[PDB]
Design a protein around this ligand. Structure first.
Ligand SMILES: [Ca+2]
Ligand SMILES: [Ca+2]
Ligand SMILES: [Ca+2]
Ligand SMILES: [Ca+2]
Ligand SMILES: [Fe+3]
Ligand SMILES: [Zn+2]
Lengths: 166, 397
């Protein structure tokens, strides 16, 4: 008998139970947490350039693994019942590496480089990164708040694509 | 509290020049007399700077005001520097003025096509219109086939205004474009137009009486002036036909050597100078006429390394002291833009959305009712000319 897990999700009793089953099967060494190796052992994930970003966002306490609460809370970002602002904040978090609430020039470059690879020259990438920030930076601190981020991408309706069945 | 970190504290490629973060204000651009400061404007634009939208309108409208006053067929005398298509290549336009000479002590005639294709069209317009305001009687601008609603909606120039400035500026440009002269009679001996001749245009008077303040129609004299080309076999004709339907453009005509000879003789003209068509040397001198020993037709093309892929030279035509001299020049570096001016968020977000959702679906499918592109991607002369024939055509409807 242990103390209750406490969390914030869109999921009901049934769904949490089903997510719990996937968690245990994914938990190879059965330690109660999910390591990078355990995620990477799924073949379909090995050539995904974004796996680590997702894990870093799920890992909210910061210890490098994903426990059941953070697993539930992470998946819930993708619930069919999630609002637009929630799906956008998740996409925002992909670019916001240090989680300080802003997107810096350096971060934007790094996350793009991660996805673009060697398609663009570094110089080219740096310039469209410069121009993207300068255009969206309403208050001139040189970075991109969430409110500014939404102003740019809010009309793209990508949030309709970020949905999973549980 | 601390200040935010200096913005380039974590910029990865530090050597790359960072654009200005402020738009030029009206006080910075316009002097006491309401006259533009052209060197301030240039230095800002070279850095990829932008101006207050109210200034963009003010520049474009004053330019339009001046152009509207002008004859449909202006008359300009030597000495003069004649330039062909520019196509939004601002960093090459800079080079062109270094090659042809300062607009302050040099007479210029531009045959059109200031926008589309290159991603610095609005800067070209702004800079050229400022020169027109400063030197209304020594700098001249004709209309090319791209200065119209039809082509700018289809190509990138409408997007460019919407992204960098606004719809209002785009609109003000369309009215300024309607103001542009269609042709120039140069030194009473060359007719200068963007495209060429028309089966419905036989005298200079037929040009003089054209009503130009409108979108170019899909057929007719005005359309032809902007759209026609010499035939592919100019000066060495199989058929003796004067005009034929222009298969390449999808509108207007090809004109051939006899068509030009007739028009040159019926109007007492030495030759026809025009643009509109890419050239490896940045110019072309067509078959000389027997009567004069002078090239009947000249193409002049002022956008080097067209579309970053042609590797062509550019040229301007310098006409002084009874010598026509062709100044050639190569390209110059220019900053990068994603196709259609998309920011890296709009560009990447879809990929992000697809790949994280893909990951979660693959993760969640670990149990299968036992519960009872891999990389983002950016969107010589004869080779790049055949990959671009579809784009030298009049967009349908
Ligand atoms: Ca584990
Ligand atoms: Ca954790
Ligand atoms: Ca940050
Ligand atoms: Ca900001
Ligand atoms: Fe062209
Ligand atoms: Zn053209």
């Amino acid at each position: 008998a242990s103390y209750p897990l406490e969390m914030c999700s869109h999921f009901d009793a049934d769904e949490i139970k089903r997510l719990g089953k996937r968690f245990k099967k994914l938990d190879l060494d059965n330690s109660g947490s999910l390591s990078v190796e355990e995620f990477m052992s799924l073949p379909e994930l090995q050539q995904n350039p974004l796996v680590q970003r997702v894990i870093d966002i799920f890992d909210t306490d910061g210890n490098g693994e994903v426990d059941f609460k953070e697993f539930i809370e992470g998946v819930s970002q993708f619930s069919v019942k999630g609002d637009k602002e929630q799906k956008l904040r998740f996409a925002f978090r992909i670019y916001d590496m240090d989680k300080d609430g802003y997107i810096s020039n350096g971060e934007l470059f790094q996350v793009l480089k991660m996805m673009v690879g060697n398609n663009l020259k570094d110089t080219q990438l740096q310039q469209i990164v410069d121009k993207t920030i300068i255009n969206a930076d309403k208050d001139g601190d040189g970075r991109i708040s969430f409110e500014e981020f939404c102003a740019v991408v809010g009309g793209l309706d990508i949030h309709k694509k970020m949905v999973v069945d549980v | 509290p601390p200040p935010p970190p200096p913005p380039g504290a974590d910029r990865v490629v530090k050597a790359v020049p960072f654009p200005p973060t402020h738009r030029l204000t009206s006080e910075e651009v316009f002097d006491l007399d309401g006259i533009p400061r052209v060197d301030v404007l240039k230095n800002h634009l070279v850095k990829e700077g932008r101006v207050d939208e109210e200034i963009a309108l003010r520049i474009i409208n004053e330019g339009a005001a001046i152009l509207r006053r002008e004859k449909t067929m202006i008359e300009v005398e030597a000495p003069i520097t004649v330039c062909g298509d520019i196509h939004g290549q601002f960093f090459d336009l800079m080079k062109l003025f270094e090659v042809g000479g300062s607009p302050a002590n040099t007479r210029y005639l531009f045959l059109g096509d200031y926008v589309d294709r290159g991603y610095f069209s609005i800067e070209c317009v702004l800079y050229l219109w400022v020169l027109k305001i400063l030197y209304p009687s020594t700098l001249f601008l004709l209309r090319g086939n791209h200065e119209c609603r039809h082509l700018t909606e289809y190509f990138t120039f409408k997007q460019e205004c919407k992204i960098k400035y606004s719809e209002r500026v785009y609109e003000a440009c369309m009215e300024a474009f309607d103001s542009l002269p269609l042709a120039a009679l140069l030194n009473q001996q060359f007719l200068c137009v963007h495209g060429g001749l028309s089966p419905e245009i036989h005298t200079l008077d037929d040009i003089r009486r054209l009503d130009r303040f409108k979108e170019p129609p899909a057929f007719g004299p005005m359309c032809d002036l902007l759209w026609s080309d010499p035939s592919e076999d100019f000066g060495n004709e199989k058929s003796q036909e004067h005009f034929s339907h222009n298969t390449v453009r999808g509108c207007s005509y090809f004109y051939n050597y006899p068509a030009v000879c007739e028009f040159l003789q019926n109007n007492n003209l030495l030759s026809i100078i025009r643009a509109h068509e890419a050239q490896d040397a940045g110019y072309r001198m067509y078959r000389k006429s027997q009567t004069t020993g002078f090239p009947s037709l000249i193409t002049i093309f002022s956008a080097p390394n067209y579309l970053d892929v042609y590797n062509n030279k550019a040229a301007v035509l310098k006409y002084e002291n009874n010598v026509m001299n062709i100044r050639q020049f190569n390209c110059s570096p220019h900053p990068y833009w994603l196709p259609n001016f998309m920011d890296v968020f709009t560009w990447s977000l879809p990929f992000v959305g697809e790949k994280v959702t893909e990951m979660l679906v693959n993760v969640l499918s670990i149990c299968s009712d036992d519960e009872l592109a891999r990389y983002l991607s950016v969107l010589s002369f004869e080779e790049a000319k055949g990959l671009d024939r579809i784009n030298e055509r009049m967009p349908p409807r």
